[PDB]
């Protein structure tokens, strides 16, 4: 459904602090259920962080970030937000918001592919 995801600038952060990454979605139709968060550590491949699940309309986070990740979305401004707390030096990565590809069939524990991605936001932890 042709979109454009624009992310907030690069942050340099001190360990034990928190970072809030934003993601402005332009074009088509905003869905809080389609924009998900991932991260890419240097030399590593992308890693899924979280999303807002439909029906329940509740944010859901990967085990790793559970307790210190907060995902929200503002349907009025068509902006998705992410907040990672108690920053560790291992949280040094480029943070991505990405939109999902809708599967022909969603089954037990199946996931999504991602067609559009934001430019990424480098978060560097001291």
């Amino acid at each position: 459904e042709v979109q454009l995801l624009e992310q907030s600038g690069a942050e340099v952060k001190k360990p034990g602090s928190s970072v809030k990454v934003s993601c402005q979605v332009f074009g088509d139709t905003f869905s809080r259920y389609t924009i998900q968060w991932l991260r890419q550590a240097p030399g590593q491949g992308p890693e899924w962080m979280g999303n807002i699940i439909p029906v329940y309309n509740t944010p859901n986070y990967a085990q790793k970030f559970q307790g210190r990740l907060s995902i929200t979305a503002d349907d009025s401004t068509s902006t998705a937000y992410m907040e990672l707390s108690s920053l560790r030096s291992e949280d040094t990565a480029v943070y991505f918001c990405a939109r999902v590809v809708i599967p022909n069939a969603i089954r037990h524990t199946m996931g999504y592919y991602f067609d559009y991605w934001g430019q990424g936001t480098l978060v560097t932890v001291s």
Binding site: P46, A98, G111, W117
Partner: protein, 105 residues
Amino acid sequence: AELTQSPATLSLSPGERATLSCRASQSVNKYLAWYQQKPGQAPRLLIYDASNRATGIPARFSGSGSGTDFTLTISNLEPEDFAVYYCQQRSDWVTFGGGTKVEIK
């Protein structure tokens, strides 16, 4: 479900054929996507469901495989094709491989 990408680096010349391998720890059937990531840019979906090309993707990019053995073929390499390529599975939620850096020499 874990994905192992091979080789780590693949150095080729323009016009050559690139054969990238992605191996799954358990079967993922056909639920595999391949992305291209040019440096400092976000991943670009190339192939979905093992063999289907995404919108606006050249014919030179072809996907193949099922279960645990998958292949991304970049036939007739072009200088612009230098990127790190990732495989991602969607069968058992979301996981990506470690990448294959394709260098053009």
